[PDB]
Amino acid sequence: MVSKGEELFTGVVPILVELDGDVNGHKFSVSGEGEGDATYGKLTLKFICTTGKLPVPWPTLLTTILMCFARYPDHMKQHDFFKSAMPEGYVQERTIFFKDDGNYKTRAEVKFEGDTLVNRIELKGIDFKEDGNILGHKLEYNHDSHNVYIMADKQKNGIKVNFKIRHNIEDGSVQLADHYQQNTPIGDGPVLLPDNHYLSYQSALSKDPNEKRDHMVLLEFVTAAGITLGMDELYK
Numbered sequence: 001m002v003s004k005g006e007e008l009f010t011g012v013v014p015i016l017v018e019l020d021g022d023v024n025g026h027k028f029s030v031s032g033e034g035e036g037d038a039t040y041g042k043l044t045l046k047f048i049c050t051t052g053k054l055p056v057p058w059p060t061l062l063t064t065i066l067m068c069f070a071r072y073p074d075h076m077k078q079h080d081f082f083k084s085a086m087p088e089g090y091v092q093e094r095t096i097f098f099k100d101d102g103n104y105k106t107r108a109e110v111k112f113e114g115d116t117l118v119n120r121i122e123l124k125g126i127d128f129k130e131d132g133n134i135l136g137h138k139l140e141y142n143h144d145s146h147n148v149y150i151m152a153d154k155q156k157n158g159i160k161v162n163f164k165i166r167h168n169i170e171d172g173s174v175q176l177a178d179h180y181q182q183n184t185p186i187g188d189g190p191v192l193l194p195d196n197h198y199l200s201y202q203s204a205l206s207k208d209p210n211e212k213r214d215h216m217v218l219l220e221f222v223t224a225a226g227i228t229l230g231m232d233e234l235y236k
Contacts, residue, residue: 006077007063007074009038009068012144014116015045017065023125024102024135026055028163030101034067034218039085041071041223056125057139058216060168064094064106064177065218067148070199072224077192080225081150081159087112088187090158099176102128111186133167133175140168143203147225152193156165158184159194198225 004009017032033043043066047058054061068082082090089111096104126136148163161181166174168193185191204219 002087004084005117006032006080006083006227008086008112009036009083011039012037013069015043015049015118015119016113016116017045017121019061019065019121019123020209021056021061021123021124021125023056024128024130025106027051028055030054030065032119034219036066036069038069038071041069041221043220043222045218045220046208047216047218048148054123054214054215056134057137057141059139059143059205060104060134060177061123061142062143062205062216062218063096063165063177064104064108064123066117066197066220067092067183067199067222069220070222070224076224076226079197081152081192081194084192085183085185085187086117088185088189090183090185092181092183094179094181096180098128098132098134099178099180100129101132101134101213102126102202103176109186133141133169138169138171139175141205142168142172143205144168145200147201148199149196150194150199151196153182153184154193156184157183157191157193158182169228196227198227199223199224200227 007136019030027052032045032047036043072080092108094106104125107124151162202221206217
């Protein structure tokens with residue numbers, strides 16, 4: 001018996017991810033599995049493209065393929081919409097705009113299925129350039145740190161999230177990926193509507209040396225933090 005969703009995250013929780021995608025007509029499926037530990041703000045996952053070769057670079061799918069595993073410090077736990085929506089879960093929707101290129105539109109349901117936290121996703125990508133950084137596979141295999149800004153959506157009883165990912169290109173340039181995100185509870189019960197805050201993300205991408213399928217091994221660390229009001233020197 002659990003009073004609050006956050007109670008479901010005191011220990012290690014198994015994770016499953018299932019993604020079906022279609023980018024410029026190229027269809028694929030990805031399966032992932034691993035575990036999360038919110039007390040540590042950690043998730044470890046391995047992803048397989050089960051349909052064959054992934055038609056886009058793994059790093060472009062990284063944000064798409066679990067904010068409920070963030071470590072919210074004690075003084076911020078009342079701002080944790082993600083765990084509060086559990087076990088029923090939440091819908092996470094994004095549009096991602098790659099600058100001077102296509103966009104991804106995604107919808108995901110993140111909820112418990114038995115003892116397992118499951119992220120099921122549909123992705124549609126359109127208008128990508130055949131010789132651009134995405135379909136041309138010009139991204140480095142990494143994903144730098146980033147702070148994700150969160151704001152309550154009172155009317156939808158959820159949250160809205162915007163951030164810009166800077167993907168490194170092998171020639172030393174950057175490919176911008178503008179993320180617009182919203183999350184709404186699946187269930188009808190009350191959720192915690194957060195004050196404005198951040199999630200700080202780190203991601204580390206690797207390969208299983210024994211794995212011959214197209215795949216990504218992913219480690220994320222994510223911790224919640226407050227905001228500070230920037231001031232220019234003049235006003236200090």
